[PDB]
């Protein structure tokens, strides 16, 4: 495989555009061996084939001067939803196309499929606009299963891995931050994905035009925490002071943003049990 154009760095590795046609090649720091392992575990055994999930190609360890860990996936030339939202504006058609496709990806991860072509129930745990890619057909796929937890109904076995990495601090649910999440109950990881999905929903809705105007792209809690907030930083905002992103008033002059602020509402309850499910979100968006 021919590494051609690097397209990013990160806190855990780097991503290249290579050929083998075009493929993406994430190259992990060996300080992040556990994420490469976990991701390679899920893709090679769960067989995750779905429109709204980053398709997988292969996984290997090679040369390069030294023993780098490669995860080779479908290349999407339009990149992250995060970079996409800072470049472009959305209308009604492209914005619903995007939040629905994310919702169906998260739902398909969250439900256990039984049968030959089945899968366990999977919770993402680091969902964010940088971990969603936009592909050249309107849909988006979810990526980075490095922290994924799995649950199999047949055994009631919860499988959380041994990755010491924690999710992106900005998108953490309050139960994660105050450290009262039930670690034994798989559903609480599903409710962590929903909280972050609500944040992503706010990110996307801002960039949808209505009555001729938009908001600039901003990351969640942009107005109250610094770039790269730390653990204690987000704790003050989400748990103690109980802050949520603000709804622009111009959403109440459009019926779509009306019912998009409807959803975010019901992913943001601090009590995680009250939060919507990805199936319910995906149902509502249809
Ligand atoms: N399959 C892919 N196709 C195209 N671009 C991709 C792909 N996977 C990742 N990227 C982009 O490559 C860049 C490198 O990012 P990456 O190292 O994967 O994580 P990140 O963007 O830094 N987010 P984070 O892991 O939270 O730090 C980002 O701009 C990604 O959007
Ligand atoms: Mg980067
Ligand atoms: Mg399977
Ligand atoms: Mg990533
Ligand atoms: Mg990514
Ligand atoms: Mg991935
Ligand atoms: Mg990873
Ligand atoms: Mg493991
Ligand atoms: Mg900020």
Author numbering: 208 to 227, 230 to 274, 276 to 496
Sentences from the paper on this structure:
Upon ligand binding, bone morphogenetic protein (BMP) receptors form active tetrameric complexes, comprised of two type I and two type II receptors, which then transmit signals to SMAD proteins. Here, using hydrogen deuterium exchange mass spectrometry (HDX-MS), small angle X-ray scattering (SAXS) and molecular dynamics (MD) simulations, combined with analysis of SMAD signaling, we show that the kinase domain of the type I receptor ALK2 and type II receptor BMPR2 form a heterodimeric complex via their C-terminal lobes. Formation of this dimer is essential for ligand-induced receptor signaling and is targeted by mutations in BMPR2 in patients with pulmonary arterial hypertension (PAH). We further show that the type I/type II kinase domain heterodimer serves as the scaffold for assembly of the active tetrameric receptor complexes to enable phosphorylation of the GS domain and activation of SMADs.
In one ALK2KD mutant (ALK2KD-KK), two lysines within helix I (K492 and K493) were mutated to alanines; in another (ALK2KD-RRK), R490 in helix I, along with R485 and K497 on adjacent loops, were mutated to glutamates. Both ALK2KD mutants had greatly impaired ability to dimerize with wild-type BMPR2KD. In particular, ALK2KD-KK completely lost the ability to dimerize. The amphipathic helix I is almost completely composed of basic residues on one side, such as K492, K493, and R490, and together with the αH-αI linker lies at the center of the large basic patch within the ALK2 kinase C-lobe. The ALK2KD double mutant (ALK2-KK) displayed a dominant effect on the BMP4-induced transcription, almost completely eliminating the basal reporter activity. We also obtained crystal structures of the ALK2KD-KK in the presence of AMPPNP and the ALK2 kinase inhibitor, LDN-193189. These structures of the ALK2 kinase domain with an ATP analog demonstrate that K493A mutation or K492A/K493A double mutant do not alter the ALK2 kinase domain structure when compared to wild-type ALK2. Hence, the disruptive effect of these mutations on BMP4-induced ALK2/BMPR2 signaling underscores a functional role of the C-lobe-mediated ALK2/BMPR2 heterodimer in the formation of an active receptor complex.
